[PDB]
Ligand binder design. Structure first.
Ligand SMILES: N[C@@H](O)Cc1c[nH]c2ccccc12
Ligand SMILES: N=CCc1c[nH]c2ccccc12
Lengths: 109, 360, 109, 361
């Protein structure tokens, strides 16, 4: 379920799901570094019926994972609403900006 | 006996050339520009652009500019963000121009890497993630200005009626205009009134750009305009792309570089799809709509061939569309576009195609 | 017919045909550099019935062309007959060794 | 509520791991190693290896060694050929060892990037295009010097019965043996008699490697043998892989890393295809044949699944095969191999898979 682009909390992922890349929804694959910054999505949880803030931190410093590419756009907005925008590399400020995969971290309601 | 030689120029005339920016997202450190002849689909050559390159051709047609990021050991070591100048005919590297390590890394929207109308300055988007606009002096081969006044704004729309002016879209729903001096430093600036509601009717950043005005389409199929015939930009809108029947089937725009303007006629081209709802703003085109911007009414609609991005050549009356891998070539000399050919396998993952300039 | 892997002169090509890459059978695409060294193949000409030496110089210093990949092996031999061998990068000694495409240069009978 | 973390180790234990060297030929500057769990097909992580990377695991199973080429600006600027040392469990970079700018650039045959039996030296093929063998001192993190004696030879076959000796195949059709001193320099050497006719019966370079001997197959389905139980290598062959029926249908070997030896049983594994002729030596396997090297008879044949390369695990009695993109896992504890599973999409363009070492002392 979590490895599917349709999984509820992946609603604003543009990238490869880290859970298909040797990591999980909340951990970077070995040898890849979390981004301190991210875009944010608001996603609806069909199970409990509530909406949640999801932080899409990237994992960085390794070349493209290539697995489970997703391009979902719920509530995503262009770069003049920068932290809602997912057509930029959220690895952009890491020590190494090479993009590896995207995580989907639950923040709160 | 035959002898292999190098040093050769591109085999087709400049006027035949198009540039397909292949992100190669699956292997993004080996992005490149593929150069094609649009008249016959022939592959002419390529320019390597390392990690997530961006590309534009100089306004005078003589050089190709790329923007990219290197690291000493790719995935580790010191970062170098650069602009490179390449010869357009030999497809060879000429000069590297150092940038601060904050050039935009992101999908290839036209407005992230542009130039002034006079061709003397390259104008590029930075994100650290704080946004600013960077200015490169082409003659000097130098980064000369960092426009921090553009914080909280995004993308560069050059004004074709002024030599060194451009606009950017800001978080307040208005436009910031920057006028550069002959040294590439900001000479003056101005801010428009609110053009669109950011919360209620966000626009796509891609302009349908005329000589003295620009049109933008929104997530819900409205059109906004910015008139820059004067020093102060005048803004208006919305008018709707949609009639009642269109609304009933929930038609809305979608794509990336999703609009274009044919300047002689005023026709605006827009990728559209039915069953629009939250989250469909990047969907492939079901149709291309052709809008008369004077009457503010649709004049034609044609199959979209799943296209995501387009570009227009004014002088040959052409539109290219691009579905990520394939480039379609259309004759737009009449209101209904006519499909001339498709170039299959032009890229693995491209969201941007551009003609070689012929205007000078 | 020169863009097909079956073309007679391409009988020991392992790589992308330069003629599909903006070059020709005997010229590098713009901005790629010929290798001074090469593997050699002996190919049968289906017209005159004679065998010809073909020199497979690479074009170098640009990333992979990606078009018209061929892997033909007529009279190809392992690395202990080094100049008959096509599983190595004949760009190896160039100022930049990145492999772009392979030419098929007719030497003679 | 949740917090993103890095610094994690590979989730499956070492004994489950395999390494698929993906050349990514279409984008050869972004080659990498994909780490998979062979028991369930799970992707575990990866190591980036830049332009045309090569890879091996340290004999002790602690480190991954890669070999690659960088340039300051990829397609221009100064060249750096390197070996890199990576932690196997964290999949993180630890050390770069500088090489002379002539490491072999080529497809991933095992014998281009190897190590001595004692693990103290990395032993690699150079080509400038003049050939030599390069020696890296693992403890020092240094390049030693070229083994120039190996000019006109190709590839590295370690001698599993000696701590720092290896062989290479030469253009005269014999083997050159190199015995290193404790410092990684050549201490002694010897050259065998001609093993095979280079003109009339060229062999594939991939050894079917035993502890004190190695077997090689030829373009025409013959087998040659090198026995290094003594200080001088004794060479023999050919015998034929082919019975009369086989010969009638023109069966010959084909592939890249195309042979394997199960040491305890003496079974040799070979990719084979029918209708052989000049130019078919790299054809995908129609079948895998299992040969008894003691009786010199075939004991099994099974579908090839278009495989091109293989590797054998002595410790778990397994064989992996690889068709360029997919990895097949076989139980080889009996004469007839049994297919356990296939891992689809393990690579885009791989000609080499290797197990994480278990045991092996
Ligand atoms: N989640 C994003 O960082 C993945 C991405 C989207 N567009 C990009 C451009 C360059 C690098 C990464 C990306
Ligand atoms: N003409 C042979 C191209 C080639 C064959 N194998 C290679 C490995 C690395 C780089 C290039 C190659």
């Amino acid at each position: 379920e979590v490895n599917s682009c349709d999984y509820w909390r992946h609603c604003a992922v543009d990238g490869f799901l880290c859970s298909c890349c040797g990591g999980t929804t909340t951990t970077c694959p070995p040898g890849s570094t979390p981004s301190p910054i991210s875009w944010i999505g608001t996603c609806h949880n069909p199970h409990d019926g509530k909406d949640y803030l999801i932080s899409y931190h990237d994992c960085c410093g390794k070349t493209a994972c290539g697995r489970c590419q997703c391009n979902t756009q719920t509530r995503e907005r262009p770069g003049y609403e920068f932290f809602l925008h997912n057509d930029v590399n959220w690895c952009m400020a890491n020590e190494n900006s090479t993009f590896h995969c995207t995580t989907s971290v639950l923040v709160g309601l | 006996r035959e002898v292999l030689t190098g040093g050769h120029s591109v085999s087709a005339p400049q006027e035949n050339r198009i540039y397909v920016m292949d992100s190669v997202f699956m292997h993004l450190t080996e992005s490149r520009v593929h150069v094609y002849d649009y008249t016959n689909g022939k592959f002419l050559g390529m320019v390597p652009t390392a990690f997530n390159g961006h590309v534009q051709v100089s306004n005078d047609g003589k050089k190709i500019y790329t923007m990219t990021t290197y690291h000493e050991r790719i995935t580790r070591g010191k970062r170098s963000d650069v602009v490179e100048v390449w010869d357009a005919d030999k497809l060879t590297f000429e000069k590297e121009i150092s940038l601060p390590p904050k050039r935009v890394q992101g999908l290839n929207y036209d407005g992230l890497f542009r130039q002034t109308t006079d061709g003397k300055f390259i104008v590029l988007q930075n994100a650290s993630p704080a946004t600013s606009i960077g200015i490169v002096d082409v003659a000097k081969g130098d980064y000369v200005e960092d426009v921090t006044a553009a914080a909280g704004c995004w993308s560069v729309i050059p004004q074709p009626n002024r030599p060194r002016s451009f606009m950017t879209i800001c978080g307040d729903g208005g436009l910031l205009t920057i006028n550069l001096g002959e040294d590439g430093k900001v000479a003056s600036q101005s801010r428009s009134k609110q053009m669109f509601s950011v919360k209620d009717d966000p626009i796509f950043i891609a302009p349908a750009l005329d000589k003295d005005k620009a049109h933008f389409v929104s997530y819900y199929g409205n059109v906004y305009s910015a008139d820059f015939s004067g020093d102060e930009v005048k803004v208006d809108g919305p008018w709707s792309l949609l009639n009642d029947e269109d609304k009933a089937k929930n038609w809305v725009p979608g794509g990336y570089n999703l609009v274009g303007l044919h300047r002689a006629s005023g026709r605006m081209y827009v990728f559209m799809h039915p069953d629009g709802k939250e989250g469909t703003h990047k969907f492939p085109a079901a149709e291309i709509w052709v809008m008369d911007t004077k009457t503010k009414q649709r004049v034609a609609r044609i199959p979209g061939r799943d296209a995501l991005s387009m570009t227009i050549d004014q002088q040959r009356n052409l539109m290219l569309t691009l579905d990520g891998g394939n480039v379609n070539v259309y004759d737009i000399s009449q209101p209904e576009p006519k499909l001339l050919r498709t170039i299959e396998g032009a890229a693995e993952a491209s969201l941007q195609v551009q003609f070689h300039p012929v205007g000078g």
